[PDB]
Design a protein around this ligand. Structure first.
Ligand code: MG
Ligand code: MG
Ligand code: MG
Ligand code: MG
Ligand code: MG
Ligand code: MG
Ligand code: MG
Ligand code: ZN
Lengths: 166, 246, 110, 295, 174, 153
């Protein structure tokens, strides 16, 4: 096994000199050995990337997946750590910077078919990792406009040089 | 197929295992404070007077009967103990103990502070960064009272000395992310404390160790914190209605 | 039939992450005016309805004790009265249900 | 005086910021004030805010993002309060939205704020060769057709009614102002300092004196968003981006024996209460009609 | 800005929902009754019939079927097609649609304003008609062009003529 | 091809469909407010509307008695229907029952729930969706049109 996500909260940075930009907070939290599957949990994790914590909880409130309740508990208990263990005021000023799902330890069983045959059954366990960063959510990138495509294409035609020239 | 999981951690305690310790636990210092000194409410204004403050404190030392018996008890248990020289040793211990927290050195702090004092000054600042300095001492420290207790179970005698110190300190606590949390660096705030020391007399070594820190009930409130807090409201179950106390 | 070759992870990622198979967000989430919790626009509030359902069960539990038999049902209208209240003139001729708790705010007397 | 439009705007911003720093310097230490939440949704919540730097918007951020977006006007004790004016003393707070059963206070505030946006568009639309003098924003109830703003134009611009395209140009500029997110800043300024801000405008000086007569302390309220400073009565909505549908309806002429005032009328609806296209066009036609309500 | 979804009846109060329905209903009757004078509102010039000319069709609603008998005793089945609201919407020039024949646009029966697109509602507002359900394109020669907004009736077809019918058939699924 | 089919396939067939709605209807008459799956509650609404219509016919009409005999599987509810529910509903013609969508059941199946009830029941009112008050900004603007319209017309 490997447990490195838990130890990321023990990193102590040197004090900041006056005049430097304020360092946004970073909270690392995870849950181990969830009965939910790895692939099924991924779709929920992909859903809440880049959204603020309040709207992330709203989306998972009404989701019918069994993992929706599990993730909501993780975010709520991670928010309490941010406001108490860390000096993060404005408990609504957090956004989910990164969320992902890993695989745990599986239990192997025997699944019967018939004719004396069998198949190995894998009990599935998965982990959930979430990182909360203080601040408003970053703005999502818009698709490239017509001018942007034209600018890149003209620039590409201007980088051309005589191949195998001299 | 018959493979299962192990390693479920739980903490269970029973009376039977605690009573079956072959070697009883040895305590270097007592848990609580035997008697809490009650300073008069006028100390905030007497401290600005030199002759009145020193003379009044000196009388309190020479007039208490229980305190004088405790002083004699220390002398009989261990010679070459002087009340006059104690505050200078107590003052240096106080400065050295806090400078250990600044450097986050726990090995030295164990010798300076006692077992009942170590968790209080370490637990909260474990992951933080503090910067503490000493600049001035407006009033020299005075010994308030000395008490002793005789535990007949083992014959152990602990001598507690209460010292009142008027100290000028510069405290600044930094967050683990490097941002300022509690106080500035260049402001020499004036602070007053009643530090209680403790020494084990039966122990041939018996280092003088700081035991506790007593704050007067009428002490001015501490400087406000920079971070804004919110007290949550009472969590309400659906079948319970909110009631407003007045 | 049996597969001819192993699907590469490059192909699997395209299929497993197609926009159709992803979870769609919900834009019809609103805050309940009464209790401040979350609810959808076309759905009753979960907290407010649970508040009502608990009270309804208590009222029905009191009715059961007032009709011991399993096939005993009133032939008249029913009115529920809480502590500190007495039946009205229009409420006479109907069975009376008594509850010790104070009349709830949401419940309205007529 | 010889002041270009760029310089006079810069002078007011420097004067406004100088006054703002003076107010901040009046509080040397951060003082903790206990605010008790008396709202219907979350009773019993107690806030511990800083004096003169903590705004009710920061008070709302402790609860959830829903209070940040839904709330428009906060009710300190029983007095309406902006969501960007710092708190002063320990009190009780309540948040008012459009959805509440009595949005009358919020409705008036929204009508006032949209009038201020039109004045900014009107002032910075005419060429510098013409003089534009903003008079005031008369208080008209929301039950009327639309909010109106009075503007005095140049003497050589007397016989000029804006065309359909010209009216639509003001709306396009207003929507551009809506596109950028500019908060509303509320500051209490002494009467004589306010006269310095509006030295060029004769009508504004009269308006400041009239408002200062109603208060024994000779104190007036100034609101600034972006680079525009104007005097208005009552609170304002916290953010510019609250408005979604905005339109300048039409203009009208009110001739007085001393001067001529141009009445610019426009109709707007917020993001929360946006209406259908069919309903919007019906309401827009009524806004064309004259609005006459001053006292 | 994650703006929430909305509909026309979301923010309307109980005392104004009947009012808005009356407001739109009165507009439709005024607009429909103001188009009943095609020859009194400066129509386009009318040309005499020429060989090879094509006329303008209609959009009708299929009611049902009835039996019908002829004078020779034979039995025929006729389908009742009703024209509810038919107005020409827009005219496309010959060189901008096909290059051979002009195109005339005809709308279907009246529908509610509250469930159409912003562009669709705006398009009808300029003309001054309530929204239509189905819109079809008719190929018409230049000598039979009609000014947009001219109503059409079932009398456009005289008995004895042979006509075509185009509509979506009954969908039976997979 | 299910064109024109207004009924739903429930249970083990057409006979089990009636019996499932027979038990639900019996519970609705006795308790006056029950919650079940949204599809089954929607079907139950049609029968609960017409059962009151049979109740209005009277205690003496034989067809009503036989119809109420089959649907009310508990025999102590027939007097209740003809003496409580029927006398209560005399004014309205079709406004007998309300249907609202309860949130999904907190179980594995995650079914779509609904609550069905009779008017004027002796139970706490459901949290009905309340419309915006007339004092709202949008409503106030529209009331301006009505006041001006009624002034001239
Ligand atoms: Mg076998
Ligand atoms: Mg295998
Ligand atoms: Mg496998
Ligand atoms: Mg079909
Ligand atoms: Mg069907
Ligand atoms: Mg089935
Ligand atoms: Mg149905
Ligand atoms: Zn609720």
């Amino acid at each position: 096994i490997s447990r490195k996500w838990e130890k990321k909260n023990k990193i102590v940075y040197p004090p900041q000199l006056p005049g430097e930009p304020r360092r946004p907070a970073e909270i690392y939290h995870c849950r181990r050995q969830i009965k939910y599957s790895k692939d099924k949990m991924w779709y929920l994790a992909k859903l809440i990337r880049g959204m603020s914590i309040d709207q992330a909880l709203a989306q998972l409130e009404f989701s019918d997946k069994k993992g929706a309740q599990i993730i909501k508990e993780v975010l709520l208990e991670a928010q309490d750590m941010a406001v108490r263990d860390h000096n993060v005021e404005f408990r609504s000023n957090l956004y989910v910077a990164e969320s992902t799902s890993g695989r745990g330890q599986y239990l192997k069983r025997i699944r019967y078919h018939g004719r004396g045959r069998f198949g190995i059954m894998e009990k599935v366990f998965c982990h959930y990792f979430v990182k909360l960063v203080e601040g408003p959510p970053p703005p999502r990138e818009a698709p490239k406009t017509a001018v942007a495509h034209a600018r890149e294409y003209i620039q590409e035609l201007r980088n051309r040089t005589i191949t195998h020239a001299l | 197929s018959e493979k299962e999981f192990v390693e479920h951690a739980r903490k269970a305690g029973l009376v039977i295992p605690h009573e079956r310790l072959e070697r009883p636990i040895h305590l270097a210092c007592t848990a609580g404070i035997f008697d809490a000194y009650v300073p008069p409410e006028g100390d905030a204004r007497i401290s600005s007077l030199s002759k009145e403050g020193l003379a009044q404190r000196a009388e309190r030392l020479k007039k208490n009967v229980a305190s004088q018996l405790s002083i004699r008890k220390i002398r009989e248990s261990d010679p070459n103990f002087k009340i006059k020289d104690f505050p200078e040793k107590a003052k240096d211990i106080f400065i050295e103990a806090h400078l250990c927290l600044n450097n986050s050195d726990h090995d030295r702090l164990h010798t300076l502070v006692t077992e009942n004092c170590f968790p209080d000054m370490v637990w909260d600042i474990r992951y933080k960064t503090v910067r503490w300095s000493f600049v001035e001492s407006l009033e020299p420290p005075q010994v308030v009272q000395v008490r002793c207790s005789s535990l007949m179970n083992q014959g152990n005698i602990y001598g507690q000395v209460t010292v009142r110190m008027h100290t000028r300190q510069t405290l600044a606590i930094y967050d683990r992310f490097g941002r300022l949390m509690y106080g500035q660096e260049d402001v020499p705030r004036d602070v007053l404390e009643y530090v209680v020391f403790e020494k084990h007399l039966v122990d041939p070594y018996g280092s003088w160790r700081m035991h506790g820190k007593i704050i007067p009930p009428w002490a001015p409130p501490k400087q406000p914190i920079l971070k804004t807090v919110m007290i949550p409201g009472p969590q309400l179950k659906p079948w319970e209605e909110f009631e407003e106390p007045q | 039939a049996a597969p001819k070759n192993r699907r590469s992870i490059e192909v699997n990622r395209c299929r497993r992450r197609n926009p159709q198979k992803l979870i769609k967000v919900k834009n019809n989430i609103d805050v309940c005016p009464e209790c401040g919790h979350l609810k959808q626009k076309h759905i009753l509030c979960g907290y407010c309805y649970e508040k009502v359902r608990k009270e309804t069960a208590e009222i029905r539990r009191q009715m059961g004790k007032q009709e011991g038999g399993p096939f005993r049902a009133p032939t008249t209208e029913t009115v529920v009265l809480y502590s500190g209240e007495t039946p009205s003139e229009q409420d006479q001729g109907k069975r009376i249900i008594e509850r010790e708790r104070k009349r709830p705010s949401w419940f309205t007397q007529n | 005086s010889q002041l270009s439009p760029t310089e006079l705007i810069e002078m007011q911003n420097d004067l406004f910021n100088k006054e703002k720093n003076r107010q901040l310097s009046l509080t040397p230490r951060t003082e903790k004030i206990e605010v008790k939440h008396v709202g219907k949704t979350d009773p019993g919540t107690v806030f511990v805010m800083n004096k003169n730097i903590s705004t009710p918007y920061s008070c709302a951020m402790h609860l959830s993002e829903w209070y940040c977006r839904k709330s428009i006007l906060a009710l300190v004790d029983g007095q309406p309060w902006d969501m960007y004016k710092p708190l002063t003393k320990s009190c009780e707070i309540k948040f008012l939205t459009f959805k509440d059963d009595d949005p009358g206070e919020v409705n008036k505030a929204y009508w006032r704020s949209c009038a201020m946006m039109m004045g900014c568009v009107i002032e910075r639309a005419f060429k510098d060769e013409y003089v534009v003098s903003l008079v005031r924003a008369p208080e008209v109830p929301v039950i009327a057709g639309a909010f109106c703003y009075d503007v005095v134009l140049d003497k050589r611009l007397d016989e000029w009614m804006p065309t359909k395209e010209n009216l639509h140009s003001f709306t396009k500029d207003a929507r551009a102002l809506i596109y950028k997110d500019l908060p509303f800043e509320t500051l209490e300024v002494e009467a004589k300092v306010a006269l310095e801000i509006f030295q060029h405008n004769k009508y504004k000086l009269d308006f400041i004196e009239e408002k200062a007569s109603q208060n024994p302390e000779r104190i007036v309220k100034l609101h600034r968003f972006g680079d525009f400073i104007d005097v208005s009565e009552g609170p304002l909505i916290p953010r510019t981006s609250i408005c979604f549908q905005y339109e300048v309806s039409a203009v009208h002429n009110l001739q007085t024996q001393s001067s001529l005032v141009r009445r610019f009328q426009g109709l707007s609806l917020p993001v929360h209460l946006r209406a259908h296209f069919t309903i919007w066009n019906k309401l827009l036609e009524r806004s064309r009609k004259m609005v006459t309500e001053d006292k | 800005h994650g703006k929430s979804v909305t509909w026309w009846d979301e923010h309307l109060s109980e005392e104004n929902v009947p009012f808005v329905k009356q407001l739109v209903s009165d507009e439709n009757k005024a607009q429909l009754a103001s188009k009943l004078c095609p020859l009194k509102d400066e129509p386009w010039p009318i040309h005499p019939w020429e060989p090879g000319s094509s006329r303008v069709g209609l959009i009708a609603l299929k009611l049902g079927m009835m039996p019908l008998w002829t004078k020779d005793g034979q039995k025929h089945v006729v389908t009742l097609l009703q024209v509810q609201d038919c107005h020409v919407l827009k005219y496309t020039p010959k060189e901008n649609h096909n290059g051979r024949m002009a195109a005339l646009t005809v709308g279907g029966k009246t529908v509610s304003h509250f469930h159409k697109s912003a562009s669709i509602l705006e398009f009808y507002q300029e003309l001054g008609l309530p929204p239509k359900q189905k819109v079809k394109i008719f190929n018409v020669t230049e000598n039979a062009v009609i000014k947009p907004g001219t109503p059409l009736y079932a009398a456009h077809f005289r008995p004895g003529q042979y006509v075509d019918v185009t509509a979506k058939t009954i969908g039976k699924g997979f | 091809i299910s064109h024109g089919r207004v009924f739903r396939r429930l249970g083990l067939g057409p006979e089990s469909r009636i019996h499932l709605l027979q038990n639900l209807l019996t519970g609705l008459v006795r308790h006056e407010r029950i919650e079940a799956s949204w599809a089954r509650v929607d079907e139950l609404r049609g029968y609960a509307e017409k059962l009151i219509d049979y109740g209005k016919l009277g205690d003496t009409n034989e067809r009503a008695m036989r119809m109420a005999d089959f649907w009310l599987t508990e025999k102590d509810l027939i007097p209740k229907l003809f003496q409580v529910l029927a006398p209560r509903f005399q004014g309205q013609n079709g406004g007998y029952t309300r249907m609202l969508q309860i949130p999904n059941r907190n179980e594995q199946d995650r079914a779509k729930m609904a609550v069905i009830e009779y008017k004027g029941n002796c139970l706490p009112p459901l949290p009905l969706p309340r419309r915006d008050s007339n004092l709202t900004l949008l409503n106030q603007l529209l009331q301006g049109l009505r006041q001006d319209q009624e002034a001239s017309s």
